[PDB]
Write a protein that binds this ligand. Structure first.
Ligand SMILES: *[C@@H]1O[C@H](CO)[C@@H](O)[C@H](O)[C@H]1NC(C)=O
Lengths: 51, 87
């Protein structure tokens, strides 16, 4: 753990939980991530996210 | 390094040179077999243990002012402050 300062090991882990929460919110806010996981048969209101 | 228990220091400064100054520092010592209430600076001296970490060096090399003020190890914990701890 020596090649990075203990300021940096906390700032990576704080950004690891930070970007994870932003990418979750920004995928639900976006309409393009909503689609069907069943492309074989046609639509039966099966629009579903993955995140 | 005196041999007796009595030491006398004088200062003769005349009329035209009253700016001269000196600041000495005596230290009582006993020749070592060093015992309790001794410290043994390693220079033919037993000094009293009140002279150990006194803040002021009393032997030739600071053997008394050594291995003192060794506060606990810290890191990022005490870096939580007005500057870094806000970030
Ligand atoms: C050491 O010096 C102190 C004065 O600072 C004196 O009162 C004391 O008797 C001496 N001896 C011990 C064992 O403290």
């Amino acid at each position: 753990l020596n090649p990075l300062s203990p300021d940096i090991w906390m700032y990576v882990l704080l950004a690891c939980l930070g970007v994870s929460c932003v990418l979750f919110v920004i995928a639900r806010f976006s309409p393009y991530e909503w689609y069907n996981p069943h492309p074989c048969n046609p639509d039966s209101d099966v629009v579903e996210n993955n995140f | 390094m005196l041999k007796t228990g009595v030491g006398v220091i004088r200062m003769w400064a005349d009329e035209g040179s009253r700016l001269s100054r000196f600041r000495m520092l005596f230290t009582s010592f006993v020749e070592p077999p060093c015992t309790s209430s001794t410290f043994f600076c390693h220079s033919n001296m037993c000094i009293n243990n009140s002279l150990v970490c006194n803040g002021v060096q009393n032997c030739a090399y600071p053997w008394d002012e050594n291995h003192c003020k060794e506060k606990k190890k810290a890191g990022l914990f005490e870096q939580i402050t007005k500057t870094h701890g806000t970030i």
